Amino acid sequence: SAKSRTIGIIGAPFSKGQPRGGVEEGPTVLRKAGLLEKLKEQECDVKDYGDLPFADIPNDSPFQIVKNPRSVGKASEQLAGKVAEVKKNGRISLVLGGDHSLAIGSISGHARVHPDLGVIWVDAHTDINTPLTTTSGNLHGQPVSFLLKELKGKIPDVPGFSWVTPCISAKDIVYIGLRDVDPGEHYILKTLGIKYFSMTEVDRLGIGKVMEETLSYLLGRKKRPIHLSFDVDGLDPSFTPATGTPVVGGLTYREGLYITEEIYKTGLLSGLDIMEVNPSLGKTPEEVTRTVNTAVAITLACFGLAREGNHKPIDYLN
Amino acid sequence: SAKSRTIGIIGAPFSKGQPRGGVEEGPTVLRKAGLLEKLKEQECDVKDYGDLPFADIPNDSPFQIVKNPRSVGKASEQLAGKVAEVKKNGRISLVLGGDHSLAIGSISGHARVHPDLGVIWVDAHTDINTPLTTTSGNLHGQPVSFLLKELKGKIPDVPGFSWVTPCISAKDIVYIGLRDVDPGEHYILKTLGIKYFSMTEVDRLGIGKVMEETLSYLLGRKKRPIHLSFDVDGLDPSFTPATGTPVVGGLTYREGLYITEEIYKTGLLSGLDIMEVNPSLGKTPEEVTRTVNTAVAITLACFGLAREGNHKPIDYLN
Amino acid sequence: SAKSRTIGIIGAPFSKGQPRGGVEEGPTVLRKAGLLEKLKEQECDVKDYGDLPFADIPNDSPFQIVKNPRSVGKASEQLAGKVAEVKKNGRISLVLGGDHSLAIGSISGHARVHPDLGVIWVDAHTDINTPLTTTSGNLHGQPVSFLLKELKGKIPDVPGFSWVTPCISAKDIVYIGLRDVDPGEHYILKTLGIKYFSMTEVDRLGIGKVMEETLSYLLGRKKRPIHLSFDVDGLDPSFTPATGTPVVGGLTYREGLYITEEIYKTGLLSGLDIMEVNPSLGKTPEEVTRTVNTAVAITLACFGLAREGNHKPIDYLN
Numbered sequence: 001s002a003k004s005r006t007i008g009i010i011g012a013p014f015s016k017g018q019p020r021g022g023v024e025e026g027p028t029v030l031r032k033a034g035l036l037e038k039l040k041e042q043e044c045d046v047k048d049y050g051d052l053p054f055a056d057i058p059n060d061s062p063f064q065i066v067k068n069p070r071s072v073g074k075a076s077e078q079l080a081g082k083v084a085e086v087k088k089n090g091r092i093s094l095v096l097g098g099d100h101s102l103a104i105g106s107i108s109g110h111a112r113v114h115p116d117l118g119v120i121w122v123d124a125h126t127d128i129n130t131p132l133t134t135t136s137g138n139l140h141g142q143p144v145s146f147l148l149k150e151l152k153g154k155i156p157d158v159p160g161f162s163w164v165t166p167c168i169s170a171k172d173i174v175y176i177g178l179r180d181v182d183p184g185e186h187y188i189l190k191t192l193g194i195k196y197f198s199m200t201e202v203d204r205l206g207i208g209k210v211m212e213e214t215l216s217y218l219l220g221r222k223k224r225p226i227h228l229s230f231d232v233d234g235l236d237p238s239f240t241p242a243t244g245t246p247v248v249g250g251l252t253y254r255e256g257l258y259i260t261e262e263i264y265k266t267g268l269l270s271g272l273d274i275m276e277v278n279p280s281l282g283k284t285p286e287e288v289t290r291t292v293n294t295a296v297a298i299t300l301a302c303f304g305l306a307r308e309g310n311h312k313p314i315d316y317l318n
Numbered sequence: 319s320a321k322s323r324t325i326g327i328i329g330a331p332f333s334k335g336q337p338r339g340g341v342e343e344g345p346t347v348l349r350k351a352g353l354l355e356k357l358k359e360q361e362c363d364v365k366d367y368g369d370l371p372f373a374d375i376p377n378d379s380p381f382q383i384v385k386n387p388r389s390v391g392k393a394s395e396q397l398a399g400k401v402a403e404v405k406k407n408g409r410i411s412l413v414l415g416g417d418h419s420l421a422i423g424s425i426s427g428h429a430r431v432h433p434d435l436g437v438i439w440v441d442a443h444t445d446i447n448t449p450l451t452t453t454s455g456n457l458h459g460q461p462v463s464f465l466l467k468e469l470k471g472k473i474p475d476v477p478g479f480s481w482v483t484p485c486i487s488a489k490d491i492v493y494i495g496l497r498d499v500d501p502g503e504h505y506i507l508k509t510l511g512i513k514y515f516s517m518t519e520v521d522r523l524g525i526g527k528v529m530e531e532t533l534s535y536l537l538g539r540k541k542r543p544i545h546l547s548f549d550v551d552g553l554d555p556s557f558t559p560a561t562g563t564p565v566v567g568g569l570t571y572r573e574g575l576y577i578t579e580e581i582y583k584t585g586l587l588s589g590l591d592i593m594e595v596n597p598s599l600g601k602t603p604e605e606v607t608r609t610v611n612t613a614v615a616i617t618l619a620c621f622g623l624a625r626e627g628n629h630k631p632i633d634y635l636n
Numbered sequence: 637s638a639k640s641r642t643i644g645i646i647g648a649p650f651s652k653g654q655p656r657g658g659v660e661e662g663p664t665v666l667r668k669a670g671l672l673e674k675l676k677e678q679e680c681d682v683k684d685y686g687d688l689p690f691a692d693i694p695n696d697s698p699f700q701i702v703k704n705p706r707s708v709g710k711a712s713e714q715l716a717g718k719v720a721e722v723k724k725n726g727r728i729s730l731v732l733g734g735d736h737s738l739a740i741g742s743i744s745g746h747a748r749v750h751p752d753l754g755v756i757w758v759d760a761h762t763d764i765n766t767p768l769t770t771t772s773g774n775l776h777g778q779p780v781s782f783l784l785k786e787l788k789g790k791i792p793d794v795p796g797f798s799w800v801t802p803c804i805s806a807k808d809i810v811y812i813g814l815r816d817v818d819p820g821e822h823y824i825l826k827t828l829g830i831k832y833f834s835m836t837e838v839d840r841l842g843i844g845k846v847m848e849e850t851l852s853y854l855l856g857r858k859k860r861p862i863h864l865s866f867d868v869d870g871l872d873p874s875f876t877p878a879t880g881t882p883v884v885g886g887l888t889y890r891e892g893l894y895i896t897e898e899i900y901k902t903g904l905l906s907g908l909d910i911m912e913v914n915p916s917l918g919k920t921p922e923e924v925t926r927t928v929n930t931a932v933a934i935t936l937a938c939f940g941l942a943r944e945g946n947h948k949p950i951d952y953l954n
């Protein structure tokens with residue numbers, strides 16, 4: 001199969017990056033929906049690297065207000081090694097989350113093989129709080145801070161994060177779908193000059209112009225690998241309700257498919273994160289199926305599935 | 319009244335073009351919503367040509383996998399004669415469906431009077447499967463193939479389709495709202511070079527630019543009659559749920575109204591089809607009423623109803 | 637604090653401008669939602685002037701078909717005095733409605749202090765029916781007619797409105813979200829050449845271009861105070877269902893936030909109306925909460941709440 005359709009599946013059943021239980025069941029419900037089989041039906045070379053075993057760390061004391069540091073740190077350390085392994089074998093790493101703190105591991109691991117990578121962060125939130133700016137102490141709203149080179153010296157010695165080496169610069173990340181940014185996070189965003197397309201920007205320009213500008217900002221000089229970190233809460237709760245931090249007025253089902261269809265077309269998708277799917281937070285079983293089916297569709301569009309249609313290189317009329 | 323508001327209503331109670339019963343009740347529920355009365359209030363010259371009597375054909379054996387061949391062929395032959403009769407009487411033919419296989423008859427009948435006509439196909443699907451490329455065998459997903467001049471020789475001698483003569487070229491049809499295109503259908507779409515606006519194009523350009531490009535492509539060279547074949551499944555299941563083949567991430571209620579308002583504005587709407595309203599496939603009676611009201615509003619916008627308002631040619635301030 | 641964040645809240649519990657009871661509870665439920673507390677958390681200087689006493693006007697027989705003329709007239713006259721008082725204190729007037737007939741008073745009072753003001757009218761309706769063009773006789777669909785200079789000699793001597801002097805020219809008002817315009821209203825809108833952005837224009841251009849054009853049309857020649865008269869029915873009934881006159885295919889939550897975010901950014905918002913919130917017209921208790929939460933979120937965006945985020949002028953990393 002083609003470079004853009006060669007995949008390495010990594011299940012990441014991890015929840016300790018946030019307090020709401022159930023997000024660890026995210027790979028399980030995505031697998032049950034037949035994601036792996038649906039990718040194979042779409043001419044993909046799928047290798048399953050299995051679901052990562054995250055060992056329970058007893059006496060995991062908090063770093064100030066920051067909850068479960070050793071658990072989050074080790075989970076990302078394990079994921080970093082696994083992403084790097086998948087990348088070394090010439091496959092697009094597909095991380096099935098699990099909470100977004102795992103993006104520390106997913107982006108770090110990918111950067112060990114592809115240091116020149118560009119990040120497209122589709123989320124309602126920036127996840128750029130430092131262990132000092134954070135008000136919740138939930139590490140799922142902190143992964144970008146640990147990854148940015150400009151925030152070196154601003155990140156204190158947090159237990160379980162000694163292995164982390166900042167791999168991405170402020171100029172190498174683009175946000176799409178922002179609508180709930182903390183004051184500390186908004187300060188970082190402005191002072192570091194990070195490129196972002198909040199809901200205000202999406203409303204102003206349209207998803208067409210947003211994607212045009214996103215890809216031109218990262219690829220303009222020359223072709224480079226693309227790491228798409230997709231948080232399902234980036235999409236509106238009418239499409240993805242079964243998530244931990246849902247915010248109204250999000251990206252539509254159509255806009256989400258548009259972002260992913262555009263990234264596939266470049267043939268540069270190198271790393272992918274499908275995060276914050278929480279099957280225990282659906283108000284009805286239909287809300288759960290709706291979130292999962294939306295997340296499956298988002299993933300299928302990243303690896304070829306086009307709304308205009310798809311066809312094998314054969315004569316259907318002969 | 320004006321040419322753009324002179325209508326000839328044709329009731330098409332037919333379901334044998336697909337296996338889901340209830341789509342034949344479409345004209346009855348559309349009439350019960352007060353469609354004819356609502357049009358007359360909108361300064362329209364409305365003439366009811368009645369509901370076409372489609373006689374049940376016994377021992378109608380399928381051609382390979384193609385279900386009910388004689389029944390579909392006869393229903394479209396009856397509609398072809400009726401549309402032509404309406405068109406000769408200087409009226410805009412309004413076909414109330416019924417499944418989309420009737421479009422063979424509606425377009426063939428319209429083409430007998432106006433051979434220079436252009437087709438605007440609003441649907442989630444292409445309906446361009448040939449009797450050989452089809453996997454389901456349902457003729458409602460096959461009308462474009464029978465009508466296209468480029469597909470002559472690929473269409474075998476299907477019983478009851480001997481009257482069918484290809485009336486339109488690949489260059490005379492524009493699709494709007496595509497999101498579920500079969501591999502065989504996508505092959506035909508690309509190799510014939512048919513102009514299309516799938517949900518990806520709608521998201522990229524916006525419905526404003528989609529309509530600007532659609533009308534410029536078909537009416538650019540010279541003013542030609544417009545045939546609008548509107549499948550209710552073209553619109554999102556949140557607005558048209560009581561339909562046979564619903565597909566997520568559809569055209570909004572607004573976009574649907576904008577397509578129809580822009581077509582009215584040209585003063586070239588010559589043929590209209592309101593297809594796939596199945597009043598027995600709505601989960602609740604509210605879902606049934608929602609589909610019918612959306613279908614009614616779409617039809618009203620085709621014959622003058624503007625969201626900015628409407629006024630009679632009199633002084634309201636006197 | 638900032639001029640764009642200095643607020644003077646005016647509770648206008650008035651319903652006699654329409655026949656549906658409960659709209660008088662609009663300032664009560666908006667307060668209960670924590671509007672004042674939320675505004676104060678957004679660095680706003682908030683002064684509460686309380687709910688205006690609308691002393692009963694019994695034996696208020698109709699003027700032709702026009703219902704409750706003296707009650708509407710006096711409620712607007714009293715509101716005008718209070719808006720003018722709030723304006724003289726150097727605060728942005730925030731009128732918590734109540735039905736839209738109160739806009740007669742809100743705009744008149746604001747114009748006494750700032751006669752150079754421009755109006756942004758966010759509604760599904762024009763509310764430009766004269767007491768002679770109105771078919772319902774409900775004064776909530778007549779405020780703009782009493783305010784427009786060009787309609788002088790066209791407004792009959794309605795009891796309770798002798799105090800009214802037209803304060804805005806046809807060229808100083810912009811409509812956003814129109815989809816239910818009466819024939820009499822459409823005649824007025826087109827003959828006076830009033831700038832409007834009906835749902836057709838919003839679909840054609842996108843909310844980005846709509847706001848760019850709206851603000852250029854009003855502030856282009858010279859900078860002047862902006863009066864935002866926001867009817868909650870301007871937004872789709874999927875966001876604001878607890879309202880008197882709901883119309884399908886409305887402005888999205890995102891579009892409403894975009895309009896209000898763009899108005900704040902000018903730093904020229906001087907008058908604001910949050911109208912037609914009716915807590916007694918919710919099909920379920922959730923529909924009531926949804927409307928009030930949408931109305932609160934719209935108001936927060938008018939005074940600084942940005943989706944991209946907000947931060948205090950302090951070093952968040954130190």
Ligand SMILES: O=C(O)[C@@]12CCN[C@@H](CN1)[C@H]2CCC[B-](O)(O)O
Pocket residue numbers: 099100101123124125126127129134135136137138140141142180181182231233244245276
């Ligand atoms: O915990 C925090 O720092 C929060 C608190 C307020 N709401 C959000 C912004 N900052 C939340 C993060 C959500 C993480 B994620 O994008 O869902 O993965």
Ligand SMILES: O=C(O)[C@@]12CCN[C@@H](CN1)[C@H]2CCC[B-](O)(O)O
Pocket residue numbers: 417418419441442443444445447452453454455456458459460498499500549551562563594
């Ligand atoms: O039967 C077929 O050929 C199908 C099968 C898969 N889903 C659709 C695309 N091709 C269906 C057509 C629906 C017809 B109509 O647009 O609803 O009128």
Ligand SMILES: O=C(O)[C@@]12CCN[C@@H](CN1)[C@H]2CCC[B-](O)(O)O
Pocket residue numbers: 735736737759760761762763765770771772773774776777778816817818867869880881912
């Ligand atoms: O009463 C009238 O004149 C109406 C009648 C038909 N529907 C509307 C347009 N004209 C209604 C006004 C709604 C007022 B308001 O924007 O909700 O404040």
Ligand SMILES: [Mn+2]
Pocket residue numbers: 100123125127140231276
């Ligand atoms: Mn996230």
Ligand SMILES: [Mn+2]
Pocket residue numbers: 123124125231233234245276
């Ligand atoms: Mn998030």
Ligand SMILES: [Mn+2]
Pocket residue numbers: 418441443445458549
């Ligand atoms: Mn169809």
Ligand SMILES: [Mn+2]
Pocket residue numbers: 441442443549551552563594
């Ligand atoms: Mn269809």
Ligand SMILES: [Mn+2]
Pocket residue numbers: 736759761763776867912
């Ligand atoms: Mn109003």
Ligand SMILES: [Mn+2]
Pocket residue numbers: 759760761867869870881912
């Ligand atoms: Mn209104």
